[PDB]
Amino acid sequence: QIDSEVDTDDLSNFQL
Amino acid sequence: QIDSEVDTDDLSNFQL
Amino acid sequence: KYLVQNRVTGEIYESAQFLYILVAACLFSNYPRETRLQYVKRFYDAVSTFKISLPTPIMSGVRTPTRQFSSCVLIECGDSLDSINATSSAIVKYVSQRAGIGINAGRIRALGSPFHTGCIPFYKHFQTAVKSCSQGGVRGGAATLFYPMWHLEVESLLVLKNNRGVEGNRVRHMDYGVQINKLMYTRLLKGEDITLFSPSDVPGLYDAFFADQEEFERLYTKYEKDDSIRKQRVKAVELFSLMMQERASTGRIYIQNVDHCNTHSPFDPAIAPVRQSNLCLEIALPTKPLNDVNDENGEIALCTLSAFNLGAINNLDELEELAILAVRALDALLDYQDYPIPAAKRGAMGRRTLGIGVINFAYYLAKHGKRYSDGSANNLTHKTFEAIQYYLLKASNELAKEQGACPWFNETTYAKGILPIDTYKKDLDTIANEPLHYDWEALRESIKTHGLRNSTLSALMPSETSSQISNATNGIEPPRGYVSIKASKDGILRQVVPDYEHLHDAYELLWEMPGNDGYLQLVGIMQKFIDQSISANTNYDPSRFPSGKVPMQQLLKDLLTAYKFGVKTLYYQNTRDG
Amino acid sequence: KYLVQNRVTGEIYESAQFLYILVAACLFSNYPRETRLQYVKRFYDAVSTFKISLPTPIMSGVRTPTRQFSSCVLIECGDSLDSINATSSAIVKYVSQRAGIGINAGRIRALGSPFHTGCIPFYKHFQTAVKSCSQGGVRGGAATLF
Amino acid sequence: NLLVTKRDGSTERINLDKIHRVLDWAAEGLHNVSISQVELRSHIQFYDGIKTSDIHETIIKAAADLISRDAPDYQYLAARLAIFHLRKKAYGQFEPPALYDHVVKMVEMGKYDNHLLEDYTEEEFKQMDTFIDHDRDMTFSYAAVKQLEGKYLVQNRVTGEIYESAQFLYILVAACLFSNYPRETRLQYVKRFYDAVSTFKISLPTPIMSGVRTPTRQFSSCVLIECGDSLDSINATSSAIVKYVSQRAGIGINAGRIRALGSPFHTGCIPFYKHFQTAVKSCSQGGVRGGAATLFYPMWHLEVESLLVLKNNRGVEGNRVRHMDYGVQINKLMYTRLLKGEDITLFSPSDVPGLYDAFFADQEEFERLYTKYEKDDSIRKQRVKAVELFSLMMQERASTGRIYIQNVDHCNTHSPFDPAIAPVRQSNLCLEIALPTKPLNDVNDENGEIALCTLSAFNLGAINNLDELEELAILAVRALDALLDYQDYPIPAAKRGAMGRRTLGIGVINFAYYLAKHGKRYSDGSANNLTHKTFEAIQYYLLKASNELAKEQGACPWFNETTYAKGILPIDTYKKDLDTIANEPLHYDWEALRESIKTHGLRNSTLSALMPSETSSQISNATNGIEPPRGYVSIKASKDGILRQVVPDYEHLHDAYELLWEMPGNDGYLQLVGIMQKFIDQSISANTNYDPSRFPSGKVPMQQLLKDLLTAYKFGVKTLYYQNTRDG
């Protein structure tokens, strides 16, 4: 099973 | 559990 | 379970050597002063130094006020309500003394005959008979029930301990022995049909099944062609499949090769056929069904048991003194003990049958650097089991010269001058070339002249308790591991295989065997010399097979292998887990 | 249940009044010729006009080659293996002919006595005796134990 | 004495010495193998009158049961014992007959195609028989021989007779694919291809390996079908599927065009997906086993939320289509919404003109139209939180392992195809194929297009240096381009696809072993430059072969549609962040070739694609595709016993290998896929991998799944295939 724990601030850094 | 797979030709060789 | 003790207060009144000396005193008590005490001494020595092992009833009671020592009985049941009741009453009397029961019930007619209701309600009755003296109708009291593969009800009978049926379809707490012969296998091999008959509808057919193979051939085909006779038809593969299926899951549907028990046998199958076995499938003796609990014309086969410890003898010639000791001690016991049922007394005083086998065989092979699975122990086994049988027959012969041959001796193939070395399954020649080392001919003659005190001498039984006492590997069985773990309210009990230190790699532990062929070959070689039979297991580790499932092909192949090497009986199937 | 017929073919061979008169003729067959036929008549009248009623085994069997008519037995078991064995043997015989059984097993000693294993194992054994001749050990043959 | 029943059927004395000789023969050159051990384990199983065939089965199996990491050469002992056995089955003796005598007999039995006899003279068969080295049969592992005997060698499916041995297979496949070559160059081509395949330099798919030389012409084993938004196209798509799965082809289905439920397909998507499923399963043993498909649609489709959960088993029956896999199609805009923590707006494709086309072909046009339709509220639309939609997709991806991802912008910005004329809009079953398709009117519509791909692979463990790839690329491309002309096409749209673009997919096997033998790993970055070096050589030589072939035979009919025609090369279009993770310079003259391509074009519009492999790699004893092995020893079941295969050169390389579960995470592997994709025409079947016991309370966090997803995006990864989750 997975852990649904998303951090939008942690993601938002990434450059695509 | 067993595997019900009988080969009558494979058996028929055997000398009793 | 050995030392004379106060069962309620938990006091112990005696030590192991008093046990040993006094058992010796009792079994030889009736000997002439001339030879008595030297017999007592040599038997004390043989048992206190573990050369000879003796069963629990004898070891715990001989010297005490009791006379109940019979721990296995064989009962045949005729096709009548009087015989059914005689059989039932005999059982109750025997299980009240904690004896194992072997029951031949194949004669009982099938359901829907002229036992309109048939077999299974009567099997239920024997079960409760067997359990009538058990703690809570479950724990203790054991039986194996025998019948032919060709019985009309066979399909229902095979699944009797499968737990996926309604209650009236199941008799779960007994084990079963399926009886098979050459004709039955041929039908499997040739891929043909097997025709099922009720024994009541096919005159002479049941008798021949044991006693006469080509007569069985004739009658069977006759009744197959004759279609006024009530009959069912099944595909040989499917019937064998079902049997082995139930054998594999419960591990306790046994096999008995009835042709082998009668062509290779101390008994003339015309006068005294072998028609069943006991609980563990190592006993093979004549029986006659009973009218009545007290019927003096019935016969209940009892066997008296002992074993040689193969780890405690230094060379094979020690077996002469030991065979003298074992046979004499046991033949005296036959006169000593009581017989709660006349048919049993008849069996024991008529034939005087004994069953002496081995313990510590695995350790013996290890210490001679041979294994089970590869063929490396064939000639050594032939060497070993020849010495056993030769000296056992020599003891019984010296005893027939001293005290007269057994009353029914004339019924043995022995009386006729035949020996096991004359009748053994001939394919044994292809797997061992050890020649005989003892003069079977001088003995053939000395037997023709003076006869045998006992009609049978040898039978290879399992052991658990006997072997633990002398720290020995059980029977002829390879240990499952180096250390045996047992529970008791006194803590975990551990036993280490004898001489683990020097022999750990010499041992071939049970699950290290690639398959059964090697072991089955040794049983074959052993059976060449064994009067009765051998409690031989088949073993399977699922994780040696694709998708952890043991194939039917392999089960049938091992079954036929055992047949081919003259194996009389097949006991447990053990399946490993994890 | 009553008329003589063929088990297999289902062919019926008689009518009620033949059953009645022949049950009569059989039961009074040993009566002296001075009174016999007169009894036979009066008994016939009594049953055929529903005044006296008789159990199934009698009504179906009396007149045929059988002599089994007992439809219920009472057996008392004593406190010994010989008696348990005789009780069981007797039950088997009697259920083979479809009789209902009354068993008194009150004297069997209790679990723990110097039977040591208790009544219930023997009770089970009586139960298989009772059911030894029915179905697949379940349907037909009944007992009450005391 | 021990009697034996002969090859026909009657007894004779047992010859223990003959058996010992065959064992001694089979054991030559092998190490750590005990003949004596095998003898003990097999002799015990014999019996008076054993059929002669069963004596071999017994020794083979006995040798096979002893395969271990410690004694790996039991692989070859058992194999040789099986080859020996297979010889006597096929021929009566060990020595194979003369090639011509064999061919003649087989054509006469209806087992080999009669054209071989037409296209070659007995002298030409005498010459080919001299190329053959039957001792190459001694070079197979045990598992290889089980595959050959299972699904390669021409056999009687009912009676279980084998009619041919591996080298005849190899020589004749060579003969057929080059049959139509000029006498001048034909036989030397046949020889060099025989050599390349019999010595495992080149691997070929099962349909080609089992059928090429036989009377059949069905070799297509993967098809791509696009479905328009109409009942005629739905039926055309369905009928095409049925025809293709009846030939055991994998199916990739683009169905994103189908309008959403409740539109002006009032009932919408899912009843039609059900229909494709039964279409796919229409020729399957019991509506379950065999016949496979992946179905594609956009992340922004109005029905997306229901579509994501289609193989979750916790729904009612009308909500689930469990037996197909799915590819979710995503682009830069979609990710940005996730990163910026914003909304994603869901549209039915029928309601948003030009929006679907741009999603593949034009990113800033998609940008414009999407925002327009977001502002325009006469348009039917749904709104979801980007995090939640991605969460749902990855949730379903993680539990089933078979919800795939397709970066559609990447497939069109970095591509051999001009996305205006011929956009890439879906993939195949395994996510490595990427070609133009056009939906169909009708099963026989000549204006539709079904993408087929022809496959092969280079064995990276069998080449000694990277320059061997020139001869091998010549061989692979030519052999495969001939096959395109050889095989039949059951549907016109498929014939159009294959003859218009002539697309090929040639990849690699044994990559893991290659990295091991160069002392590099997957997880740490140590294999980046070597991979760049390696995949440059592959692509350069593949393009060189196709170029030499366009010069010899004319560029493919639709060549003008490739970015290649325009003078663009993969080295011009690759995701630019690849520069930050490898500094290997190019080693080959891409410019001389850029020009020679502008001039003479390419025979094939695509050349490269990295597919998974299972069977191909087993044949040459190779690690599968680009995948790290799960362990040192692969265990397989077959009714002939447990089948074991030991990773190549375990003895010298056990610590050189980085086994799958020894990877701290995915980053290293995902970087290699990126570097590989820089040169790959099509795509790569790239997995993501997770061991729960590397994570707090054994639960893989969503954060990590999204991070790896974005990483793969960042390095220009086109597709993401399986997610494998370890257990215990």
Side-chain angles (χ1 to χ4, degrees), chain C residues 513-568:
Chain C
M513 304 197 306
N516 287 301
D517 307 76
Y519 168 95
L520 284 177
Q521 280 193 22
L522 290 182
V523 168
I525 293 154
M526 284 171 181
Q527 184 62 79
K528 178 180 170 147
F529 304 103
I530 289 303
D531 279 316
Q532 312 203 49
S533 196
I534 306 158
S535 287
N537 307 140
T538 54
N539 302 292
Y540 300 97
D541 188 336
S543 71
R544 278 193 203 262
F545 305 87
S547 331
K549 47 191 72 166
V550 194
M552 186 56 68
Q553 198 71 44
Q554 193 44 60
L555 303 166
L556 300 165
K557 201 201 162 262
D558 286 344
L559 178 57
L560 305 164
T561 306
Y563 181 84
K564 186 198 184 61
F565 294 112
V567 173
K568 285 176 186 174

Side-chain angles (χ1 to χ4, degrees), chain E residues 394-450:
Chain E
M394 296 305 287
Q395 222 153 253
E396 286 306 306
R397 174 170 175 82
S399 29
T400 72
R402 9 249 259 118
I403 300 297
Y404 312 133
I405 274 87
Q406 180 185 37
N407 294 324
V408 288
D409 48 5
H410 289 345
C411 302
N412 291 278
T413 60
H414 183 56
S415 175
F417 296 107
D418 190 319
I421 331 177
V424 165
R425 301 204 275 162
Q426 67 178 82
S427 192
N428 68 317
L429 185 52
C430 307
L431 292 269
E432 91 275 21
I433 304 306
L435 307 175
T437 53
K438 208 205 252 61
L440 277 61
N441 254 353
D442 187 85
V443 211
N444 290 300
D445 179 357
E446 326 253 304
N447 292 137
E449 198 194 343
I450 284 157

Side-chain angles (χ1 to χ4, degrees), chain E residues 222 411 414-417 424 427-428 431-435 452-458 469 473 476-477 480 501-508 534-546 564 569-571 590 602-612 626 673 675-685 718-719:
Chain E
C222 73
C411 302
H414 183 56
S415 175
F417 296 107
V424 165
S427 192
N428 68 317
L431 292 269
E432 91 275 21
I433 304 306
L435 307 175
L452 294 176
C453 212
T454 322
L455 308 173
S456 276
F458 301 115
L469 283 176
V477 173
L480 283 197
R501 336 204 102 105
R502 297 187 82 80
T503 50
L504 297 185
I506 307 177
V508 301
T534 284
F535 280 80
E536 193 215 345
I538 284 155
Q539 189 64 14
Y540 170 88
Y541 286 127
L542 276 178
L543 296 172
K544 191 160 156 298
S546 212
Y564 283 123
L569 294 168
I571 70 159
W590 283 81
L602 294 170
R603 180 66 174 170
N604 316 95
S605 314
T606 66
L607 281 129
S608 56
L610 310 178
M611 71 296 296
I626 61 159
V673 168
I675 293 154
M676 284 171 181
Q677 184 62 79
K678 178 180 170 147
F679 304 103
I680 289 303
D681 279 316
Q682 312 203 49
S683 196
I684 306 158
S685 287
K718 285 176 186 174
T719 40

Side-chain angles (χ1 to χ4, degrees), chain C residues 436-571:
Chain C
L436 299 156
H437 292 225
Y438 295 101
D439 194 9
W440 283 81
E441 297 299 320
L443 181 91
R444 187 194 305 287
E445 230 40 51
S446 194
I447 275 167
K448 272 215 267 273
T449 292
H450 312 93
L452 294 170
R453 180 66 174 170
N454 316 95
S455 314
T456 66
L457 281 129
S458 56
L460 310 178
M461 71 296 296
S463 65
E464 184 48 78
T465 321
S466 337
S467 17
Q468 281 181 69
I469 297 284
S470 42
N471 186 212
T473 63
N474 319 122
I476 61 159
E477 294 307 289
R480 276 177 243 44
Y482 293 119
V483 175
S484 186
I485 290 100
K486 197 44 171 285
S488 78
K489 92 185 230 313
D490 298 345
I492 319 265
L493 303 196
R494 287 184 171 88
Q495 194 164 41
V496 181
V497 299
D499 205 1
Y500 168 79
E501 207 204 297
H502 305 268
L503 305 169
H504 57 271
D505 301 320
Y507 285 106
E508 169 164 61
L509 292 178
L510 179 82
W511 298 118
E512 303 178 332
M513 304 197 306
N516 287 301
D517 307 76
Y519 168 95
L520 284 177
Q521 280 193 22
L522 290 182
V523 168
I525 293 154
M526 284 171 181
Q527 184 62 79
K528 178 180 170 147
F529 304 103
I530 289 303
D531 279 316
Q532 312 203 49
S533 196
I534 306 158
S535 287
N537 307 140
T538 54
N539 302 292
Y540 300 97
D541 188 336
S543 71
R544 278 193 203 262
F545 305 87
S547 331
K549 47 191 72 166
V550 194
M552 186 56 68
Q553 198 71 44
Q554 193 44 60
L555 303 166
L556 300 165
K557 201 201 162 262
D558 286 344
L559 178 57
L560 305 164
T561 306
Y563 181 84
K564 186 198 184 61
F565 294 112
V567 173
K568 285 176 186 174
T569 40
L570 278 170
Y571 199 34

Side-chain angles (χ1 to χ4, degrees), chain C residues 81-82 85 88-90 92-93 96 111 117 121-122 124-125 128-129 131-137 168-169, chain D residues 81-82 85 88-90 92-93 96 111 117-118 121-122 124-125 128-129 131-138:
Chain C
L81 298 176
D82 290 347
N85 291 339
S88 180
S89 287
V92 164
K93 270 261 202 275
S96 79
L111 158 79
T117 64
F122 291 122
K124 291 192 198 291
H125 190 57
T128 65
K131 304 298 187 176
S132 63
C133 309
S134 283
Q135 173 269 341
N169 277 168
Chain D
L81 294 169
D82 284 342
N85 282 343
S88 183
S89 297
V92 170
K93 280 287 194 201
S96 87
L111 168 65
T117 30
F122 299 119
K124 287 164 183 300
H125 192 53
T128 44
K131 252 95 165 68
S132 62
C133 302
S134 40
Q135 166 57 212
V138 276

